[PDB]
PDB file of C-alpha atoms in Angstrom:
ATOM      1  CA  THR A1332      -0.075  -0.124  -0.150  1.00 14.18           C
ATOM      2  CA  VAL A1333       0.724   3.604  -0.464  1.00 17.77           C
ATOM      3  CA  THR A1334      -0.166   4.216   2.821  1.00 17.22           C
ATOM      4  CA  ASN A1335       0.484   2.027   6.405  1.00 16.78           C
ATOM      5  CA  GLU A1336      -3.287   0.773   7.511  1.00 18.92           C
ATOM      6  CA  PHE A1337      -1.125   1.478  11.250  1.00 14.55           C
ATOM      7  CA  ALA A1338      -0.431   4.671  10.938  1.00 14.98           C
ATOM      8  CA  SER A1339      -3.616   5.541   9.321  1.00  9.80           C
ATOM      9  CA  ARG A1340      -5.508   3.821  12.438  1.00 12.10           C
ATOM     10  CA  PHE A1341      -3.353   6.081  14.778  1.00 15.15           C
ATOM     11  CA  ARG A1342      -4.159   9.256  12.612  1.00 15.11           C
ATOM     12  CA  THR A1343      -7.849   8.637  13.104  1.00 17.34           C
ATOM     13  CA  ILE A1344      -7.441   7.947  16.661  1.00 17.15           C
ATOM     14  CA  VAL A1345      -5.643  11.197  17.070  1.00 15.70           C
ATOM     15  CA  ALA A1346      -8.592  12.956  15.302  1.00 15.81           C
ATOM     16  CA  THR A1347     -10.503  11.965  17.835  1.00 16.19           C
ATOM     17  CA  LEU A1348      -8.052  12.822  20.613  1.00 15.04           C
ATOM     18  CA  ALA A1349      -7.415  16.060  19.337  1.00 19.06           C
ATOM     19  CA  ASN A1350     -11.221  16.665  18.442  1.00 20.52           C
ATOM     20  CA  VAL A1351     -11.466  15.565  22.701  1.00 20.86           C
ATOM     21  CA  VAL A1352      -8.631  17.872  23.965  1.00 19.46           C
ATOM     22  CA  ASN A1353     -10.097  21.048  22.007  1.00 17.43           C
ATOM     23  CA  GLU A1354     -13.544  20.537  23.263  1.00 13.94           C
ATOM     24  CA  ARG A1355     -11.459  20.553  26.720  1.00 17.43           C
ATOM     25  CA  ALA A1356      -9.877  23.252  26.119  1.00 22.11           C
ATOM     26  CA  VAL A1357     -12.791  25.606  25.230  1.00 18.15           C
ATOM     27  CA  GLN A1358     -14.836  24.680  28.011  1.00 18.98           C
ATOM     28  CA  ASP A1359     -11.696  25.538  30.119  1.00 19.13           C
ATOM     29  CA  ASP A1360     -11.330  29.084  28.702  1.00 16.78           C
ATOM     30  CA  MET A1361      -7.707  28.150  27.435  1.00 19.36           C
ATOM     31  CA  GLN A1362      -5.936  30.646  25.220  1.00 23.18           C
ATOM     32  CA  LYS A1363      -5.269  30.027  21.730  1.00 22.01           C
ATOM     33  CA  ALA A1364      -1.788  29.746  21.500  1.00 21.43           C
ATOM     34  CA  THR A1365      -1.104  27.084  24.163  1.00 20.61           C
ATOM     35  CA  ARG A1366      -4.232  24.990  22.124  1.00 22.30           C
ATOM     36  CA  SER A1367      -1.909  25.451  19.232  1.00 23.82           C
ATOM     37  CA  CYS A1368       0.563  24.125  21.017  1.00 25.40           C
ATOM     38  CA  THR A1369      -0.998  20.798  21.942  1.00 26.77           C
ATOM     39  CA  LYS A1370      -2.499  20.580  18.622  1.00 25.57           C
ATOM     40  CA  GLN A1371       1.040  20.793  16.877  1.00 23.50           C
ATOM     41  CA  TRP A1372       2.315  18.544  19.539  1.00 21.91           C
ATOM     42  CA  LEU A1373      -0.257  16.047  18.412  1.00 24.20           C
ATOM     43  CA  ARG A1374       0.355  16.318  14.872  1.00 25.55           C
ATOM     44  CA  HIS A1375       4.087  15.875  15.664  1.00 26.14           C
ATOM     45  CA  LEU A1376       3.266  12.427  17.361  1.00 23.84           C
ATOM     46  CA  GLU A1377       1.227  11.583  14.184  1.00 26.30           C
ATOM     47  CA  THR A1378       4.115  12.122  11.836  1.00 26.94           C
ATOM     48  CA  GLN A1379       6.780  10.144  14.031  1.00 24.29           C
ATOM     49  CA  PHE A1380       4.096   7.331  14.269  1.00 24.85           C
ATOM     50  CA  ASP A1381       3.977   7.424  10.403  1.00 24.42           C
TER      51      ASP A1381
ATOM     52  CA  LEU B1191      11.744  14.294 -10.302  1.00 25.20           C
ATOM     53  CA  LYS B1192      14.058  14.737  -7.431  1.00 25.82           C
ATOM     54  CA  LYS B1193      13.052  13.552  -4.020  1.00 25.94           C
ATOM     55  CA  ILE B1194      11.376  15.738  -1.618  1.00 23.61           C
ATOM     56  CA  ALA B1195      10.705  14.556   1.694  1.00 28.01           C
ATOM     57  CA  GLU B1196       8.133  16.322   3.127  1.00 25.58           C
ATOM     58  CA  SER B1197       5.558  15.244   6.074  1.00 25.04           C
ATOM     59  CA  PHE B1198       3.162  17.904   5.823  1.00 25.23           C
ATOM     60  CA  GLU B1199       2.245  18.297   9.219  1.00 27.18           C
ATOM     61  CA  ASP B1200       2.404  22.566   9.269  1.00 24.83           C
ATOM     62  CA  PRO B1201       0.160  24.711   7.282  1.00 26.02           C
ATOM     63  CA  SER B1202       3.475  26.223   5.665  1.00 27.46           C
ATOM     64  CA  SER B1203       4.291  22.850   4.123  1.00 34.36           C
ATOM     65  CA  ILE B1204       1.768  24.062   1.317  1.00 33.30           C
ATOM     66  CA  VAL B1205       5.333  25.629   0.306  1.00 31.20           C
ATOM     67  CA  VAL B1206       6.137  22.906  -1.255  1.00 32.06           C
ATOM     68  CA  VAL B1207       2.749  22.149  -3.079  1.00 29.04           C
ATOM     69  CA  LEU B1208       2.876  25.560  -4.055  1.00 26.39           C
ATOM     70  CA  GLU B1209       6.219  24.956  -5.795  1.00 23.21           C
ATOM     71  CA  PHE B1210       4.569  22.049  -8.044  1.00 22.44           C
ATOM     72  CA  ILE B1211       1.885  24.556  -8.973  1.00 21.35           C
ATOM     73  CA  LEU B1212       4.550  26.596 -10.437  1.00 19.72           C
ATOM     74  CA  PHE B1213       5.999  24.098 -12.141  1.00 22.55           C
ATOM     75  CA  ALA B1214       3.015  23.184 -14.039  1.00 24.28           C
ATOM     76  CA  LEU B1215       2.958  26.502 -15.182  1.00 25.21           C
ATOM     77  CA  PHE B1216       6.415  27.501 -15.848  1.00 25.06           C
ATOM     78  CA  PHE B1217       7.196  24.416 -17.487  1.00 27.12           C
ATOM     79  CA  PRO B1218       4.002  22.316 -18.770  1.00 26.90           C
ATOM     80  CA  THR B1219       6.174  19.898 -20.293  1.00 25.60           C
ATOM     81  CA  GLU B1220       9.095  19.036 -17.915  1.00 24.67           C
ATOM     82  CA  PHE B1221       6.541  18.649 -15.273  1.00 27.06           C
ATOM     83  CA  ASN B1222       4.334  16.415 -17.669  1.00 29.50           C
ATOM     84  CA  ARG B1223       7.255  14.079 -18.039  1.00 27.51           C
ATOM     85  CA  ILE B1224       7.612  14.102 -14.013  1.00 29.61           C
ATOM     86  CA  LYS B1225       4.114  14.057 -13.288  1.00 31.41           C
ATOM     87  CA  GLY B1226       3.678  11.271 -11.135  1.00 35.59           C
ATOM     88  CA  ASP B1227       6.824  11.165  -9.281  1.00 37.52           C
ATOM     89  CA  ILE B1228       5.317  14.230  -8.167  1.00 38.80           C
ATOM     90  CA  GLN B1229       1.866  12.535  -7.722  1.00 38.30           C
ATOM     91  CA  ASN B1230       3.966  10.603  -4.882  1.00 41.40           C
ATOM     92  CA  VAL B1231       4.204  13.683  -2.865  1.00 41.43           C
ATOM     93  CA  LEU B1232       0.969  14.691  -3.639  1.00 40.96           C
ATOM     94  CA  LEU B1233      -0.928  12.025  -2.438  1.00 42.30           C
ATOM     95  CA  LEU B1234       1.183  12.211   0.973  1.00 41.13           C
ATOM     96  CA  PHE B1235      -0.019  15.785   1.526  1.00 42.22           C
ATOM     97  CA  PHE B1236      -3.576  14.755   0.344  1.00 43.20           C
ATOM     98  CA  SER B1237      -3.838  11.411   2.631  1.00 44.25           C
ATOM     99  CA  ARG B1238      -2.696  13.865   5.553  1.00 41.63           C
ATOM    100  CA  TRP B1239      -4.721  16.903   4.710  1.00 41.84           C
ATOM    101  CA  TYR B1240      -7.736  15.648   3.401  1.00 41.06           C
TER     102      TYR B1240
END
């Protein structure tokens, strides 16, 4: 395959987890920058897994 | 096509996609000769983003 099925599934896992952490962030009145930071760290793990 | 290692994490990775668009404009023929080897980059970008 052009794409690992394992990395794909982990990426959808981080899709769900990232939306869960964004929900949790907006509910808890967090600054947009720290949000950008957790979101970026999440993408970072996504590529490392890739 | 010379290899391009692009993970496509940050939005600014679009810089590389932009490069390809320019290549299909400034040199449509040479681009046609290496379209495909470029598509190998584009399906990474497209998998990751869409």
